[PDB]
Design a protein that fits this description.
The structure is cut from a larger assembly and holds chains A, B and C.
Chain A lengths: L1 H11 L2 H9 L14 H8 L2 H11 L12 H8 L2 H9 L14 H7 L3 H9 L14 H8 L2 H7 L2
Chain B lengths: L19 H4 L4 H16 L16 H10 L3 H17 L7 H13 L5 H17 L5 H9 L4 H16 L10 H4 L1 H13 L4 H18 L5 H6 L2 H13 L3
Chain C lengths: L2 E7 H19 L12 H4 L11 E5 L4 H6 L12 E3 L8 H25 L4 E9 L4 H16 L4 E8 L10 H15 L2 E6 H11 L7 H15 L1 H4 L8 H8 L7 E2 L3 E2 L14 H5 L19 E9 L4 H13 L13 E6 L9 E8 L3 H16 L4 H6 L4 H22 L5
Parallel strand pairs in C: 1-2, 1-4, 2-3, 4-5, 5-6, 6-7, 9-10
Antiparallel strand pairs in C: 8-11, 9-11
Helix pairs in contact in C: 1-5, 1-8, 4-5, 5-6, 6-13, 6-15, 7-8, 13-15
Classes of the chains: A mainly alpha, B mainly alpha, C alpha/beta.
Bound molecules: guanosine-5'-diphosphate and magnesium ion.
GO molecular function, one term (chain C): metal ion binding
Keywords (chain C): Acetylation, Cytoplasm, Cytoskeleton, GTP-binding, Isopeptide bond, Magnesium, Metal-binding, Methylation, Microtubule, Nucleotide-binding, Phosphoprotein, Ubl conjugation
InterPro entries (chain C): Beta-tubulin_BS, Beta_tubulin, Tub_FtsZ_C, Tubulin, Tubulin/FtsZ-like_C, Tubulin/FtsZ_2-layer-sand-dom, Tubulin/FtsZ_GTPase_sf, Tubulin_C
């Protein structure tokens, strides 16, 4: 399966061998087992050139997986500021929700990616968005002792 | 009828050429894959090994080498599961050479506290016990109850408890248990009963109430008196809750 | 109960470790060559505790750290044999430190531990400094602990573990490493001082007004805290004298042995403290959450036990009064069912630079806030299963993460139980 080799590459980060596999017509939106496209995997492990290659060949920027995770979720979780702005520029879902009720703003706030938090907010993030337990991004800064984040959330 | 009468399987021809060097490698994953292969591909499928004219005492002495000394706890876990498989699918083989080649290594490695690893090491010790009943285990299990590591004490004593629940009464009452009962078994179980740690002591309390159940709460009433009245009622607690 | 063997593992381990040896070598009057140039007997009274030359073992998988220590100021003093270093590094992989690469080296380390313990009149216990978000300090350290725990079960295990925070390193696997390591410490150590990088940054940034704190800036706060809590151990004194007596009077339940340290006054790197504080001022740096080395609010929980160490010449009468005061004027914050749970001790020799100082070791249930933060970060990471192939590749099982997750949450619930408990 050529859609499975393109996931192997986009994950481990062999920039050159993506172009090889894609020139062989590999499925840009090929799902693995839990529904993760190559754009998901590259946006998780920080391979910026592989993200922009897949997006311009037609990668579902707002593709979800078995747990409702968009690539912007995973980029905002791990903290890849370079990739976050690339996805948003390609029409990413700034207020996407996943199976646990989190938005990308929730994940960037939990992991302390203050520089990414400000990017999401300026792209119209839902500051008052709630999760399953009922907590906003502002509640996380209150609960987690981060006053640098509380100030960045009320800006 | 013994269901073991089904035709037996042979595994010596299954081994690969690159194996002795892989298991005797410095890279952990070489050793792991080597062991993990012959276990999932070669041992796990079969259901009866070849009794006739098969020398496994070259293979088993390298499972011991890793179970004892190998620094990778993962390589330990997958090896003791191999050892169990051999002792399980080839019943009535581990007479002495086989049984004794892996016994004292296994008892040393109960020191491991990771649940998955203690699971595998103990379960293999149960395998050799069910087919090498009190051959060398009674003599060597006691030895490692006297050992300095706290974890090996509670586990090798739990081991004697496991073995004792499945004890055999063939012959008169001059089995290996009675030849060494008061001299060795009891003198060693009291060392556990009187340990500094509670969780250690609490294993001895079962391992003494499972002892009384086998050999009469009257015979051992002599060391019962020398014991605290406070520890006595804990020992009796298990005596009421332990079966045979 | 005399000698203490010291260990430092990982980059952070050797950093705050060497800083600690810098501080207390001065306080004891030892030069980098290893010769006494002091002028007091209270200095060499209990020098046999940490010295023989330090009773210190240096460990790291990263071999470069070797030279970062010896090329330091007091780097010449450590015994050459007690350097035990690997070829490659762990690279923020707890599994590499605990199961694969760190395990291959751990034997060489235990050989040196044995050697130093062999020549001890009467060992007290051990002392480990390390970081929890790393791969070596956390993975090999916690593995070293258990290996010592089973080789020396009649001895105390006391750790100075520093907690990762996004404010100091943006590495997202640190919640994994720290959570797995807490699962070890709750089962393997008698007492652990919780150094939170979150709180060290918030102190250097907000209280000391340093716009960008460096490691050296945070390490200054740590090394001073260590000498403060170890003041009882290193000088003559009645109360909290040895490691076991301390833990006996600090830890009422075996799993709940995570201390929230904090001390006063907070100074910068070599700044000038014009007017030495008064006794009531020092005392009022206890509840002051801006002095806690762990990012927790004591107001949000209850103190189980408290140990106070006042350093310097001052009124023992006034200290007793101020401590007895602050307890009963905030009686709802100290647990009622443990009477005389706060204990104070004084040492006449102050720390260098300061005329007076005060260290505040506290077992506060508020520490559950700290474990909440790590758990939420861990779970957010773990529910999306990020970077799991690192750990599983090194022989770990996915189940292990679930157990560590649940075991830390049980630890949080336990703290919450005793917080809501009543004497009635
Ligand atoms: N306070 C302090 N924390 C550190 C220092 N170095 C690293 N850390 C923290 O420790 C974690 C990194 O682990 P580290 O010790 O460098 O990895 P190791 O070499 O494999 O043990 C991160 O959370 C860092 O914030 C230091 O010098 N001081
Ligand atoms: Mg390192």
């Amino acid at each position: 399966d050529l859609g499975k080799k393109l996931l192997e590459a986009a994950r481990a980060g062999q920039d050159d061998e993506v172009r090889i596999l894609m020139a062989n017509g590999a499925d840009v939106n090929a799902t693995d087992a839990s529904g993760l496209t190559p754009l998901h995997l590259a946006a998780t492990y920080g391979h910026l050139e592989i993200v922009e290659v897949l997006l311009k060949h037609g990668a579902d920027v707002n593709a979800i997986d078995i747990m409702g995770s968009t690539p912007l979720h995973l980029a905002a979780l791990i903290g890849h500021l370079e990739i976050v702005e690339v996805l948003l520029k390609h029409g990413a879902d700034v207020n996407a929700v996943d199976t646990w009720g989190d938005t990308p703003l929730h994940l960037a706030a939990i992991m302390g990616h203050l520089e990414i938090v400000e990017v999401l907010l300026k792209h119209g993030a839902d500051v008052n968005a709630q999760d399953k337990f009922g907590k906003t991004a502002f509640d996380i800064s209150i609960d987690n002792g981060n006053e640098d984040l509380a100030e960045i959330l009320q800006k | 009828d013994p269901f073991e009468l089904l035709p037996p399987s042979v595994i010596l021809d299954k081994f690969p050429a690159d194996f002795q060097t892989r298991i005797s490698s410095t890279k952990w994953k070489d050793r792991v894959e080597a062991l993990e292969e012959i276990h999932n591909n070669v041992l796990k499928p079969v259901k009866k090994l070849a009794h006739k004219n098969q020398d496994y005492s070259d293979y088993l002495r390298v499972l011991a080498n890793v179970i004892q000394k190998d620094a990778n706890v993962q390589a330990v876990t997958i090896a003791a599961n191999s050892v169990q498989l051999l002792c399980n699918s080839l019943r009535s083989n581990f007479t002495r050479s086989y049984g004794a080649i892996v016994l004292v290594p296994l008892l040393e490695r109960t020191k491991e506290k990771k649940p998955s690893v203690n699971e595998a090491i103990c379960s293999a010790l149960d395998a050799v016990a069910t087919y090498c009943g009190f051959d060398d285990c009674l003599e060597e299990t006691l030895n490692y109850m006297k050992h300095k590591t706290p974890q090996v004490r509670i586990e090798c004593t739990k081991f004697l408890t496991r073995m004792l629940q499945g004890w055999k009464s063939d012959g008169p009452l001059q089995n290996q248990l009675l030849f060494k009962l008061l001299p060795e078994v009891t003198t060693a179980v009291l060392k556990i009963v009187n340990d500094t740690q509670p969780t250690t002591r609490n294993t001895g309390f079962e391992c003494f109430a499972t002892l009384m159940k086998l050999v009469g709460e009257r015979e051992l009433a002599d060391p019962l008196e020398k014991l605290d009245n406070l520890k006595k009622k804990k020992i009796y607690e298990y005596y009421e809750k332990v079966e045979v | 109960m005399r000698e203490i063997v010291h260990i430092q593992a990982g980059q952070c381990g050797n950093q705050i470790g060497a800083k600690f040896w810098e501080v207390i070598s001065d306080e004891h009057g030892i030069d980098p060559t290893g010769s006494y140039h002091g002028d007091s007997d209270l200095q060499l009274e209990r020098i046999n505790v940490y010295y023989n030359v330090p009773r210190a073992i240096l460990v790291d998988l990263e071999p470069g750290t070797m030279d970062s220590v010896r090329s330091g100021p007091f780097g010449q003093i450590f015994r050459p044999d007690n350097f035990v270093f690997g070829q490659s590094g762990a690279g923020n992989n707890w599994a590499k430190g605990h199961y694969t690469e760190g395990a291959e080296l751990v034997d060489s380390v235990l050989d040196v531990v044995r050697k130093e313990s062999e020549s001890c009149d009467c060992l007290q216990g051990f002392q480990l400094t390390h970081s929890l978000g790393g791969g070596t300090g956390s993975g090999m350290g916690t593995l070293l602990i258990s290996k010592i725990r089973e080789e020396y079960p009649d001895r105390i295990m006391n750790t100075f573990s520093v907690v990762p925070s996004p404010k100091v390193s943006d590495t997202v696997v640190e919640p994994y490493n720290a959570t797995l390591s807490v699962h070890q410490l709750v089962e393997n150590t008698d007492e652990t001082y919780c150094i939170d990088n979150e709180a060290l940054y918030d102190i250097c940034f907000r209280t000391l007004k340093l716009t960008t704190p460096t490691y050296g800036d945070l390490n200054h706060l740590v090394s001073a805290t260590m000498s403060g809590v170890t003041t009882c151990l290193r000088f003559p004194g009645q109360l909290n004298a040895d490691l076991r007596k301390l833990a006996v009077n600090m830890v009422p339940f075996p799993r709940l042995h995570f201390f929230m340290p904090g001390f006063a006054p907070l100074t910068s790197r070599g700044s000038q403290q014009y007017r030495a504080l008064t006794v009531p001022e020092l005392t009022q740096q206890m509840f002051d959450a801006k002095n806690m080395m762990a990012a927790c609010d004591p107001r949000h929980g209850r103190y189980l036990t408290v140990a106070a160490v006042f350093r310097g010449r001052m009124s023992m009468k006034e200290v007793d009064e101020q401590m007895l005061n602050v307890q009963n004027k905030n009686s709802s914050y100290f647990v009622e069912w443990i009477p005389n749970n706060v204990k104070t001790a004084v040492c006449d020799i102050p720390p260098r630079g300061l005329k007076m100082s005060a260290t505040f070791i506290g077992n506060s249930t508020a520490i559950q806030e700290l474990f909440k933060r790590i758990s939420e970060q861990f779970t957010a990471m773990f529910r999306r299963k990020a970077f799991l192939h690192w750990y599983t590749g090194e022989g770990m099982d996915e189940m292990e993460f679930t157990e560590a997750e649940s075991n830390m949450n049980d630890l949080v619930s336990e703290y919450q139980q005793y917080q809501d408990a009543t004497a009635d």
